[PDB]
Amino acid sequence: RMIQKFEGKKPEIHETAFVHPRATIIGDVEIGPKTSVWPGAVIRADIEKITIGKNTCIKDNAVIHPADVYHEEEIEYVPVKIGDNNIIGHRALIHGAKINDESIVGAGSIVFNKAEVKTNSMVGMGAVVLEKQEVPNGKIVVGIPARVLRELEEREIKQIKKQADTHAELAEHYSREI
Amino acid sequence: RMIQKFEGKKPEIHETAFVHPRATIIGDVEIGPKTSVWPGAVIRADIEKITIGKNTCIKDNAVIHPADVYHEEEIEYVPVKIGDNNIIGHRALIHGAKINDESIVGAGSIVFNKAEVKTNSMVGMGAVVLEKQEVPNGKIVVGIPARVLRELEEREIKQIKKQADTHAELAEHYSRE
Amino acid sequence: RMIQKFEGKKPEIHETAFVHPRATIIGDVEIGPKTSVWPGAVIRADIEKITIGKNTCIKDNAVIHPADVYHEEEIEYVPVKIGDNNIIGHRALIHGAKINDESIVGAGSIVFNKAEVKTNSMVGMGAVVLEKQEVPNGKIVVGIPARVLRELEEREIKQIKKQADTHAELAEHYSREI
Ligand code: NA
Ligand code: NA
Ligand code: NA
Ligand SMILES: [Zn+2]
Ligand SMILES: [Zn+2]
Ligand SMILES: [Zn+2]
């Protein structure tokens, strides 16, 4: 319901995506099929693009915003790219960062400017992934700053895709009730 | 303004409870007398039940959601249960966990799946109570993950109930406008 | 949209300030010129005043609330006071605190009761500035609790004002559409 234009850029949302009325999608946003956006989530693509893939969960009160960078006298803007089968947890912040496929950004965590969360990895709850930091494949990072705790079990990795499916099926049932 | 059905289940909100119109309540929610829910708070009972008791405050941008837990084949859904006289702080997350009576969940903190905040305890600000962890009676926990800092002094415990009453009174004044 | 009145007192918002429809402003709030408030932000001046200066940014899902401090008998209510050219970051909490001029409160951080963020200082992401804690002029604090990390370089301080202007200009373009 709050699908807002900005500078004549309107969100492109796939017809099988679900955006809850209490989420806020602004500007140059792209959302793929079966991707869900939940109450209070703000996806604000005003200063640069936000691209979200298919079958991804943007959980409640999560904020997604491109970065404005001031290390050069000319101001620079970094887009957000989020891949497929991801869980962006309750109250997580994705700030000018890249999330690849089948990964979990834990609840309340921050993934900051030019960072990259690689496929089949986890950002731990409340963790802060710093500027340009890389979360490696098959690992979980925790704390502030985010540091590697351990490798993920092969079951833990396989249940990410299963979580993405569960939450996409949930979103489908929301869609059926206007 | 956003009390929403889900799969036939409607939020059962007591008449003396206050839900700010900018809060979001969905599905199988039970909210008791004098309990307040503040702007941006999301209480989403779609995958399981959320039960909140009486005189409890769910402060701004707090999120309450049942847990989906993934066993070898079955998916376990874990309901949220929050008791009486609690302060769920600004931007806190209660996720498939249990809060008992007269406790403070501090601002920005997380109480995770299957965790338990016992009566007369505190989760400190920004702390993360990991799954199946108990915050014991009469104690504060801090940091990530949450670990015991010290005992709550006798005065500190009595001011929890007093704070809950102050916030329930504040909500009463919101209801009249 | 949600500029709510409380107990007779209505938000006093300058004509050049910008409040996004999805922000919530309640009660005894004072907002200076060129200041911007963004989706999901809550500025709730109900138990005491909140004063925000000019050219300041209250980013998405940020919460500003006065403090209720509990003494042996009486209850003290502490106002929020936020100065000029500040950045209150995505999902930050300013709770009964004082923020002076040209500072950054980092994303997801807490500035709690009777605390003070001095001019040209910086609260790190996910940090928790405790009760009555000062964030000193020229310095950056991090972690839980908030510990001084280092002095800010002269270039970094110069970019605080520039970031405030960039976001004030952004808000200007939002206000020209609706
Ligand atoms: Na189906
Ligand atoms: Na009364
Ligand atoms: Na201009
Ligand atoms: Zn931003
Ligand atoms: Zn959840
Ligand atoms: Zn408060």
Numbering used by the authors:
A (entry chain B), C (entry chain C): 0 to 177
B (entry chain A): 0 to 176
Publication text:
CAs (E.C. 4.2.1.1) are ubiquitous metalloenzymes that catalyze the reversible hydration of carbon dioxide to bicarbonate (CO2 + H2O ⇋ HCO3– + H+). Here, we report on the first crystal structure of a halophilic γ-class CA (CA_D). The gene was derived from SAG analysis of an uncultured archaeon from the Red Sea Discovery Deep brine pool and was identified using the PPM algorithm. The gene was expressed in the bioengineered haloarchaeon Halobacterium sp. NRC-1.
